[PDB]
Structure formats: structure tokens, C-alpha cells
Amino acid sequence: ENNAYLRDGKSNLVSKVVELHGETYATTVKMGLSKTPNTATSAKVKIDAAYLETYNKAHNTDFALYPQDLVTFANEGILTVNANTKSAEVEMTIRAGEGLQEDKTYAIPVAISDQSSDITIKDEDAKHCIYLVKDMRNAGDAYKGEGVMQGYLFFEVNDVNPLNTLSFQLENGKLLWDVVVLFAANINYDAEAGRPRVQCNPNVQYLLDNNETLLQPLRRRGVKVLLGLLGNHDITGLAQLSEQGAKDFAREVAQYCKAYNLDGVNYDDEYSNSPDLSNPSLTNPSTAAAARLCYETKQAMPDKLVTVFDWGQMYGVATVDGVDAKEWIDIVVANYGSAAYPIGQMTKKQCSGISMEFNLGGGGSLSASKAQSMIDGGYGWFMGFAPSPAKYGSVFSRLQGGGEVLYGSNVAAPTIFYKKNDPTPYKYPDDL
Ligand SMILES: CC(=O)N[C@@H]1[C@@H](O)[C@H](O[C@@H]2O[C@H](CO[C@H]3O[C@H](CO[C@H]4O[C@H](CO)[C@@H](O)[C@H](O)[C@@H]4O)[C@@H](O)[C@H](O[C@H]4O[C@H](CO)[C@@H](O)[C@H](O)[C@@H]4O)[C@@H]3O)[C@@H](O)[C@H](O[C@H]3O[C@H](CO)[C@@H](O)[C@H](O)[C@@H]3O[C@@H]3O[C@H](CO)[C@@H](O[C@@H]4O[C@H](CO)[C@H](O)[C@H](O)[C@H]4O)[C@H](O)[C@H]3NC(C)=O)[C@@H]2O)[C@@H](CO)O[C@H]1O
């Protein structure tokens, strides 16, 4: 038995989110083999539109098929076999389309076809990979180019308007913070449903109700907006859900992201109390329960970011139900003063190389030397926590010099800030 499965060749993921920042996107589709193939081993790939119905049902999603005429495989879709790497691949090109309605994820389900008889394909999962395509050609001001480090920013939204993301621009106009987090919605026990729910304090709820004026301006400029989830002093927790409790909590998180048109979640396993082990939705707090929640959340919103703060028991188990953590931890950010590290088949591109506590001051600066050190290490991210306009002097001083290194353009001093819950751009510092 020579077992094959399909994955994107560049990312090595069976489910790959693709962001078009240009007219074409090129990658390979890769079939892996468990055994060395023989001279006769062969297979092809094709778009499998029928499979999308099955995929959407399995994930409770509603991705529309990406126009097939915009996808082309080299070599008629035939996979070129490399027996010395137990794999076969073909180049695939995605072209940006014409009148595709924007802010919408399209699917390219890809199937192994016409495989020789020596190849076994154990199930429909092994037979397919999927690309989830988003046209980002117009949302480019957060996009600072291919291969660069990216910013990840927490707002304490009890106090600070996330439109202050827009205060942080390079001298060339690009937005520094690729990803921002609304810190935080909570996990808490709901007695009447008998399970955990998402519980939003009035500040979080106000932002969500008013996402069109206080959040969507960011997304239109390319910023990803995540809902932060945080433990909240009861029996429920992000690292103490049973398999069934995690499946349900995961669907509630995805539903928030869909309802308020957000881009994903950050899980932070802090401030929960001991679970009630008699409850079928809870279990012993463990990094394995955290990984289960991450896996289930990614299954429920596969086009959206699943990200964790590496603290508590939120991060460290690398496999759930045979699926490696690279498929369900998009970004991991570490505690102030340290670099995140990868697990399973993740790379440092999924990892923060610095975490700055902007409100209390710990964790270093995004200096020219730290920027080069992090580039040298292969790190994908820098993280900041709780900036506020009243501390812009300290915050921006901690960003001097790094932007030249990372992007060829330093962070510009701020000239705008926003007040809580107020869409008005005020002059910084005058209007403070
Ligand atoms: C990724 C990451 O960073 N993760 C964590 C972060 O969580 C952490 O952030 C800090 O967390 C602590 C702890 O937060 C938890 O516990 C809080 C306390 O709860 C307990 O008491 C409650 C009753 O008081 C009780 O109900 C509860 O059951 C507990 O027993 C919770 O309040 C908190 O939940 C709330 O916030 C979270 C989000 O943070 C929401 O999800 C949740 O729904 C809820 O709304 C959470 O469970 C916090 O205590 C820290 O908060 C301080 O700093 C943040 C900025 O980061 C501010 O936004 C806060 O307001 C707070 O600042 C203090 O604010 C007061 C009032 O404005 C200031 O007092 C004034 O002080 C001056 C002098 O200085 C004068 O005297 C004046 O008269 C006073 O009014 C005070 O100065 C402020 N202090 C500071 C330090 O600025 C953080 O949120 C961070 C830590 O770096 O990193 C990781 O660990």
C-alpha cells in the first residue's frame, strides 16, 4: 500500500488561504507518497467543483467556487514524479478575476485524478486539497510586500479605539500593524444552555454592533481584525473544554467572526478557574484541550486566522486527530521579553520575534538591530500590546529604526488619534 495525499506545495498545507496582491498567484500542487514510487507511477490533478458542496457541508461554510477559467495547471494537470522525494507536483496559477464581489472567499477544490493502481487514496480527505482565495488587490495599505515581517497588535478595547491602528504608518504611507486584536471577548458559563458561551462586555459589544464604523475601515485598508477571547473567572476556559465543548464553542466563535465580518480569533488562556469535571463540556485543563479548541475553530472558519498567545496551557501540543498544528495555528505570539517558537511542522514565519507591552513598558523595542536579528532568525511577526494615544510618545520611540530595516521606510511620528467609540480623526497631539 503506497498512500498518497494532496497538499499545496509551497505551504505544505492541505487547506491554504491565498491572498491575491497582484494579477497572478503561482504555487504547486503536491502529491506525497508513503513509499518510493516505481517508473510507472503517475497521477493528474483537476478542479473538483462537485466536492465543494461536500466541503461546505462538512465545515458549515458557504464558499463560492472560484471561476475555474481563472485557474490553470501546467502540463495538463499531470504530476511530475520525483521518486527521490516520494512526491509528485504540478505548477498551478491563480489569476485575479474581473467582477468578483469583494471581501469574499472563493474556493478551488483540487482532486487527485487518474492515479496509477499502485497508489492508494484512503479517503476523500486524502484525495483533495483546497485553496481559499481572497482578492486583496484594493486593500493593500497594510501590505508591505512579500517576505517581510508583519505586525500583530492587541487593543485593550475597554479603553482604546482600534481605529488608532491608523495612527501607525510608515513614511511611505503603509500601515504598520497587519493584524490587530480586540482584547477581549470572554468565555463564560451559560447556565440556561448548559455550556460555555462567548460573553462580551459592553465595550466589546459596542465595537461589534458598530463594526461598520469602528472596525471595517481597518479591513478596507488590509488590516485583519481578530476577536480576542480570554478566560473570565468561572469554570470555563480555553484550555479546559471537552472535545464536544470545544466543537460547540468553536462554532460560536466562527459565528461571531461571520456575523461581525471579522478575520479570526486570538485565544488567551488566562484568568479561568478550575472546571467542573462533572460537566460534559469541560475537561481537565491541558494543552491538549487547548489544541483541540484551536483545531475545531480552524475547522469552523478555515478561511480565517486561528492565533494564540503562548501562555497558560494554550500552546504546545502539535497534533489533533492526526492533523499537524501548521494547519490550525496561523500565528503564535509569545509573552513579553521572548520569541515564540514553532511546533509540529510550523515554521518561525508563524512566530513573533518580539512582544512589546506598550502600556507597562516591558519586552524591548523594534530597533534596527532587533529587526535585523528577527529577520535573521526567520521570524514572521512582531507583537505589541495595549498602545494608547496618551502613551504615543513612549510607544513610537519603541518603534524607531526598525521600519527602515524591515521595510525600507521608518515608522512616521503620529499625526492622528481616535477617542473611545468615536470615529472622528483627531489631531495628535493637539486634540489630546
Ligand atoms: C496577551 C496579554 O497581554 N495577556 C495578559 C493580559 O491579560 C494582561 O492585562 C492585564 O490584565 C489584568 C488582569 O485582568 C483580568 O483580571 C481583571 C481583574 O479581575 C478581578 O477583579 C474584578 C473586580 O475588579 C473581578 O470582577 C474579577 O472576577 C477578578 O476577581 C479583570 O478586570 C480583567 O477583565 C476585564 O478586562 C478584560 C480584558 O483585559 C476583559 O476581557 C474582561 O471582560 C474585563 O472587562 C481580566 O479578567 C488587568 O487588571 C490589567 O488592566 C489594567 O491595564 C489595562 C491595560 O492593559 C487597562 O485597560 C485596565 O483599565 C487596567 O488599568 C488600570 O485601570 C485603573 C482604572 O482606570 C487605573 O487606576 C487609576 O490609577 C491611578 C494611578 O495609577 C489613580 O489611582 C486613579 O484614581 C485610578 O483610577 C490603573 O492605574 C490602571 N493600571 C494600569 C497598570 O494601567 C490588564 O488588562 C497583560 C499585562 O501586561 O498581559 C498579559 O498578562
Author numbering: 45 to 476
What does the original paper state about this entry?
EndoBT-3987 is composed of two domains: the N-terminal β-sandwich domain (residues 42–179) and the C-terminal glycoside hydrolase domain, which adopts an (α/β)8-barrel topology typical of GH18 family enzymes (residues 194–476).
Here we present the X-ray crystal structure of the ENGase EndoBT-3987 from Bacteroides thetaiotaomicron in complex with a hybrid-type glycan product. We could not reliably model the terminal Neu5Ac (−9), suggesting that this residue is solvent exposed and adopts multiple conformations in the crystal. The nitrogen and oxygen atoms of the acetamide group of GlcNAc (−1) make hydrogen bonds with the side chains of Y380 and D312, respectively. The base of the binding site is mainly composed of a set of aromatic hydrophobic residues, including F198, F227, F353, and F429, located at the top of the corresponding β10, β11, β16, and β19 β-strands of the barrel, respectively. Man (−5) is completely buried into the binding site. In contrast, the interaction of EndoBT-3987 with Hy-type N-glycans is driven by the α(1,6) antenna.
